Enzyme design. Structure first.
Site, short mmCIF file in Angstrom:
data_model
loop_
_atom_site.label_atom_id
_atom_site.label_comp_id
_atom_site.label_asym_id
_atom_site.label_seq_id
_atom_site.Cartn_x
_atom_site.Cartn_y
_atom_site.Cartn_z
N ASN A 181 -9.50 -3.27 6.31
CA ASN A 181 -9.08 -4.67 6.55
C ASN A 181 -7.76 -4.75 7.32
O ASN A 181 -7.17 -5.83 7.38
CB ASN A 181 -8.96 -5.41 5.22
CG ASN A 181 -10.30 -5.45 4.54
OD1 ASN A 181 -11.32 -5.77 5.16
ND2 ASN A 181 -10.31 -5.07 3.27
N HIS A 183 -4.94 -3.51 6.58
CA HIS A 183 -3.77 -3.47 5.68
C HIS A 183 -3.31 -2.03 5.49
O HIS A 183 -4.17 -1.12 5.49
CB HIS A 183 -4.11 -4.06 4.31
CG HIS A 183 -4.29 -5.54 4.30
ND1 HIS A 183 -3.33 -6.39 3.79
CD2 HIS A 183 -5.32 -6.31 4.71
CE1 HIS A 183 -3.75 -7.64 3.92
NE2 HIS A 183 -4.97 -7.61 4.49
N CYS A 218 3.87 -3.78 3.39
CA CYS A 218 4.29 -3.49 4.77
C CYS A 218 3.15 -3.99 5.65
O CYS A 218 2.00 -3.61 5.40
CB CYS A 218 4.57 -2.01 4.92
SG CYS A 218 4.99 -1.43 6.57
#
Ligand SMILES: C[C@@]1(COCc2c(F)cccc2F)CC(c2ccccc2F)=NO1
Ligand SMILES: C[C@@]1(COCc2c(F)cccc2F)CC(c2ccccc2F)=NO1
Lengths: 260, 260
Positions: A181, A183, A218
Site C-alpha cells: 500500500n 506505506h 514515516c
C-alpha cells in the site's frame, strides 16, 4: 503452513535464506520480524481474510478501518542459522475495546525447542485520518470466532533526553522499504532503531529483547533520525523522530547479551 | 529444492511473501533478484560447496579468491503475485579464463509457463585486493564437473553524461543491506539504480528488462548517488557513483512496458 486442528492458531515453517543472515550466519532480527509478519498474513488468509490486501473484517472495510501495530515485543533465545528450519506458531486474542493482540512462538523445527517469543498490540484506526478508534462490537464479533477466548500468552517506555549518546541521521526509506500500500513496512522501523547501536556492540553481542512503540508513520518522502542512549548485558533506550526535531515516530528499548 | 536427475541444474519453488510485493501485489524485481541469489546459493550447497559461506572451490580458498558478479541481465514477462508459487531452475557454465556464468529460468509453477529469464557473468577476484584474476585450470577443473558442457543459454553500456535527468543522492546502506560477510548485497545495487526512476514511471509501467554492470563495491561507510536519464516502452540509462563525483559503482539500462 496451516491452521492447527482446532482452527485457532496457525503454524508455518521457513528455511532461513542466504540473504536473511548477518555475520554469524544466523537470521537477523529484521528477518525474524519479517517472518512474524508473513505467518500473521498467512494466518489471516487461512481464516478467510483477503488474498490481495492486509486483513480487514467486513465492518472495518465499511468504516475505512485498518489494524496498525502500536507495540511489538520480541525475545530471541537462539537465532536460527542459514538453511535451518524455523517453525512459528501464531494466534490472536481480543483486547476488548483497546485492540487485538497477535502472539508468536518460534521453534527450531529439528529440536522442537522454543527459540523465541513475540507479542504485538494492534489498534484500529481510520486509514485516511490515522485517528484511533475503539473496537466496536460488530468488528470484535467478526474476528472473535478466529481467536482462543481463554488466555493464551506467548509471555512504559520513557522518552530519550537530549543529548543522545549515539545517532544515525537522515535515514530515508527506498521503495523496497514500502509495503503493497506504499506505506513504510513496520520492520523498517526496527532496522532504523538498530542503526544507531554502535557496530562494536552488534559485533560482540546478540540482541535478546526488543520492545518498540509505534506512535506515527514515516511517509515515503520523510527523513528519520535514529537516537540511542545506553541505560545499563547491554541495555539501550531508543527514539526515532522525523528530521528537524519533528514528531516522534517510535520509542523503544533493547537488551543485548555478550556473544558466547 | 533439489538437483535435477542429471545433477547439472537445480530447481526450487518459492511462495511469494506479503512483504516481497509492491503496489500491484506482485513480486518486486528486488524480490526476484533475491530469489535468484537464494536458488544459486542452494545449488552451490547441493553440489558440495560450503553450508556456512558463499561458494568457493578448494583452490579458490587456497588463493583467497571469490566469485563476484560483473554483469546481471534479467527479463521478466510476468511478476508473480503474492501467494503464487514461482519455480526457478538454475545452472552454471564455464566462460573459459574470463569467469563463470549462472543462468536462471523462472516459471509459474501452476501454469508451467516461462515468466522470466536471467543471466549473470561472475569473475574471480582476490577477496583482499579486489583485483581480478583469470580462472586457472585448477579452479575450472574443480567446478566444471557441476556444469553442462554443451551450451545451455537462458537467452556495451555507455556512461551517463552530466547533467543527469533524474537523481537520488545520499543513498547509504543500513545493516539489512549487508550480507553475511558485511559486504553490500548485490540486490541493494538494483534498488539504488531504480530509486532515481521517477515514481510516476513505477506507478504506470512494469520493468521488463534490466542490465547492470558492477564495477566497484559500495563499502558499509560509503554514500552513493543514483543517476538516471531517459533514452527512449520507456528506456533509461543509469549510473551509480560514490558521493562527491567519486568512483563509478555500477552502470545499467532498464526497459519498461506500460501497465495493461
Ligand atoms: C491484529 C491482526 C488480526 O489479523 C486478522 C486475524 C484475526 F483478527 C483473528 C485471528 C486471525 C487473524 F488473522 C492484524 C494482523 C496483521 C495485519 C497486517 C499484517 C500482518 C498481520 F499479522 N495480525 O493480527
Ligand atoms: C559463479 C557461481 C558458481 O557457484 C558455484 C557453482 C559452480 F561453480 C558450478 C555449478 C554450481 C555451482 F553452484 C557463484 C554463484 C553465487 C555466489 C554467491 C552467491 C550466489 C551465487 F549464485 N553462483 O554461480
Amino acid at each position: 503452513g496451516s491452521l492447527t486442528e482446532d482452527g485457532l492458531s496457525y503454524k508455518e515453517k521457513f528455511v532461513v535464506r542466504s540473504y536473511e543472515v548477518g555475520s554469524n550466519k544466523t537470521a537477523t532480527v529484521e528477518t525474524i520480524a519479517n517472518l512474524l509478519q508473513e505467518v500473521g498474513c498467512n494466518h489471516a488468509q487461512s481464516v478467510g481474510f483477503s488474498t490481495d490486501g492486509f486483513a480487514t473484517t467486513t465492518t472495518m472495510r465499511k468504516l475505512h478501518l485498518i489494524w496498525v501495530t502500536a507495540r511489538m515485543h520480541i525475545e530471541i533465545y537462539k537465532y536460527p542459522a542459514w538453511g535451518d528450519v524455523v517453525e512459528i506458531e501464531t494466534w490472536c486474542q481480543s483486547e476488548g475495546r483497546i485492540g487485538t493482540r497477535r502472539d508468536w512462538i518460534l521453534k527450531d523445527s529439528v529440536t522442537g525447542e522454543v527459540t523465541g517469543r513475540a507479542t504485538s498490540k494492534w489498534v484500529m484506526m481510520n486509514q485516511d485520518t490515522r485517528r484511533l478508534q475503539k473496537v466496536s462490537d460488530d468488528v470484535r464479533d467478526e474476528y472473535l470466532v478466529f481467536c482462543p477466548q481463554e488466555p493464551r500468552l506467548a509471555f512504559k517506555i520513557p522518552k530519550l533526553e537530549d543529548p543522545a549518546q549515539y545517532s544515525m541521521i537522515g535515514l530515508k526509506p527506498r521503495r523496497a522499504d514500502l509495503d503493497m500500500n506504499q506505506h513504510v513496512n513496520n520492520v523498517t522501523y526496527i532496522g532504523w532503531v538498530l542503526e544507531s547501536i554502535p557496530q562494536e556492540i552488534v559485533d560482540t553481542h546478540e540482541l535478546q529483547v526488543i520492545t518498540l512503540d509505534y506512535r506515527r508513520e514515516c511517509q515515503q518522502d520523510d527523513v528519520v533520525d535514529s537516537l540511542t542512549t545506553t541505560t545499563s548485558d547491554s541495555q539501550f533506550l531508543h527514539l526515532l523522530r522525523l528530521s528537524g526535531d519533528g514528531q516522534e515516530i517510535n520509542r523503544g528499548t533493547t537488551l543485548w547479551r555478550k556473544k558466547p
